[PDB]
Design a binder for this molecule. Structure first.
Ligand SMILES: CC(=O)N1CCc2c(NS(=O)(=O)c3cccc(Cl)c3O)cccc21
Length: 358
C-alpha cells in the first residue's frame, strides 16, 4: 500500500462515510494493474460484524455490467446477434409494437420507453409475457434512452436462451468461473451468509427482495476482492485466455449511442477521458426518477476506446455501489457501501482519488 494511495483514499473516504452516515464500506484501487484494499465500519451493526475483504455487498445495477458482458460472450459465440429481432428468441411475443425492436434496443434502453421497474405483480413466465405484450411504447425504437430494468433484464434472459442454460448457470460457467470470481453470487449460498452484509435503509437492516428479472438487472452480490478482479478483467480483456469472453468484454465497452457527453455500452457507460468531473458528477445524478433523453446512433458502434472513463453506479434499497476505470491508465476504483447514498457523492469521491493518481 504505497503511501500516496493510502493517503488519498483515507482522506477522501473517511469524510464521505461521516457525511453520508454510511455504516460500512469497502474500497479497491487498481493502480498500474495491481489492487489495494481498504475497509471501514460495519457489515452488521447489531452483531458488530466488521467489513472485511470477504464481505459480500449487493451490487444493484452494477450487476448490469455482468449481464452486458455475458451477452457479449453469447454474441461472440455466435449464439445471438444484437441485430436480431426480439421475437426471434421469444416467438410468443406477437404484439405488433415489437416489430423492429432488436436485442440491441433491449440491451441499451432504446426500445421505446420500457419502464424502469418490472411491476411487483409480475412473477411467472406467463405474467412476464403478458406484461411485455401489453406494454405500449411512447417512442419509435432507437430514438430515446430511458434507463430500465425491464429492458436490459429481458436482454439478459433472451441472450442465454440458445445456450440452454439458466441465466445463473450461464453467468457462473461463462463469466464468474473463467475469471476466478469465486465469491460472486446471484443467490448467496448458506455457507457464505456469515459474510453477507446487511443493507441499511432508514436505519433498518434490509436485503434485496426477489423480483422478476432480478438476477439479470440487479441481482449480483460480491466481495471487494472479486470486484477488483472484475475491474482488472475489464481493464485488460486481452489477458483473458477464453476467446469469446475476451471479445464479450470488448463488445460491452463499445459505444452504441451518444447522449450528451455519455456513450452507452452493454451495461457499462463511457465518457471520453479526460473527463470534466461535473459532466459525470451531475451526469449520473439519481435525484431524477425518470430521465428520457434523445440518442444519436453511433453507426457503426465504436470499438472499446482505451481513452475512456468507463463506469456504472448501482443501488438497492440498502446498498450503494460504484465502479470506474480508465483503460489507458491501468487505473480503476470500486466503492461498495451498505447504504444507498447520493450518486454525485460517489462520483466526486472516485474522481478525487483517480485524478490524484493519474
Ligand atoms: C430505494 C429502493 O428500494 N431501491 C433503489 C434501487 C433499487 C434496486 N436497483 S435498480 O432498480 O436496478 C436501480 C434503479 C435506478 C438506478 C440505479 Cl443506480 C439502480 O441500481 C432494486 C431494488 C430496490 C431498489
Amino acid at each position: 500500500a504505497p503511501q500516496q494511495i493510502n493517503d488519498i483514499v483515507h482522506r477522501t473516504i473517511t469524510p464521505l462515510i461521516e457525511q453520508q452516515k454510511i455504516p460500512g464500506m469497502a474500497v479497491a484501487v487498481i493502480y498500474q494493474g495491481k489492487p489495494y484494499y481498504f475497509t471501514w465500519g460495519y457489515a452488521d451493526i447489531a452483531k458488530k460484524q466488521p467489513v472485511t475483504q470477504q464481505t459480500l455487498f449487493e451490487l444493484g445495477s452494477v450487476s448490469k455490467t455482468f449481464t452486458g458482458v455475458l451477452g457479449g460472450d453469447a454474441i461472440a459465440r455466435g449464439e445471438i446477434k444484437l441485430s436480431d429481432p426480439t421475437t426471434k428468441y421469444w416467438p410468443e411475443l406477437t404484439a405488433k409494437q415489437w416489430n423492429g425492436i432488436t436485442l440491441l434496443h433491449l440491451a441499451t434502453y432504446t426500445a421505446g420507453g420500457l419502464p424502469l421497474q418490472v411491476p411487483d405483480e409480475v412473477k411467472s413466465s406467463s405474467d412476464l409475457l403478458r406484461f411485455y405484450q401489453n406494454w405500449q411504447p411512447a417512442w419509435a425504437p432507437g430514438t430515446q434512452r430511458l434507463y430500465a430494468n425491464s429492458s436490459i433484464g429481458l436482454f439478459g434472459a433472451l441472450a442465454v436462451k440458445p445456450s440452454g442454460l439458466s441465466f445463473e448457470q450461464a453467468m457462473q460457467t461463462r463469466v464468474f468461473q473463467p475469471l476466478k470470481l469465486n465469491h460472486t453470487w446471484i443467490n448467496v449460498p448458506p455457507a457464505e451468509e456469515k459474510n453477507y452484509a446487511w443493507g441499511y435503509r432508514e436505519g433498518k437492516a434490509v436485503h434485496v427482495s426477489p423480483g422478476a428479472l432480478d438476477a439479470e438487472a440487479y441481482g449480483v452480490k460480491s466481495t471487494i476482492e472479486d470486484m477488483a478482479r472484475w475491474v482488472q478483467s475489464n481493464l485488460k480483456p486481452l489477458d483473458i485466455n477464453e476467446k469469446t469472453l475476451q471479445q464479450g468484454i470488448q463488445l460491452a465497452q463499445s459505444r452504441y449511442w451518444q447522449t450528451g457527453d455519455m456513450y452507452q455500452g452493454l451495461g457499462w457507460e463511457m465518457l471520453d477521458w479526460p473527463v470534466n468531473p461535473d459532466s459525470i458528477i451531475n451526469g449520473s445524478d439519481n435525484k431524477i426518477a425518470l430521465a428520457a433523453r434523445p440518442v444519436k446512433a453511433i453507426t457503426p458502434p465504436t470499438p472499446a476506446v482505451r481513452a475512456s472513463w468507463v463506469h456504472k453506479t448501482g443501488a438497492t434499497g440498502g446498498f450503494g455501489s460504484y465502479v470506474a476505470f480508465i483503460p489507458e491508465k491501468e487505473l480503476g476504483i470500486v466503492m461498495l457501501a451498505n447504504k444507498n447514498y447520493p450518486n454525485p457523492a460517489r462520483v466526486d469521491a472516485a474522481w478525487q482519488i483517480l485524478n490524484a493518481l493519474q
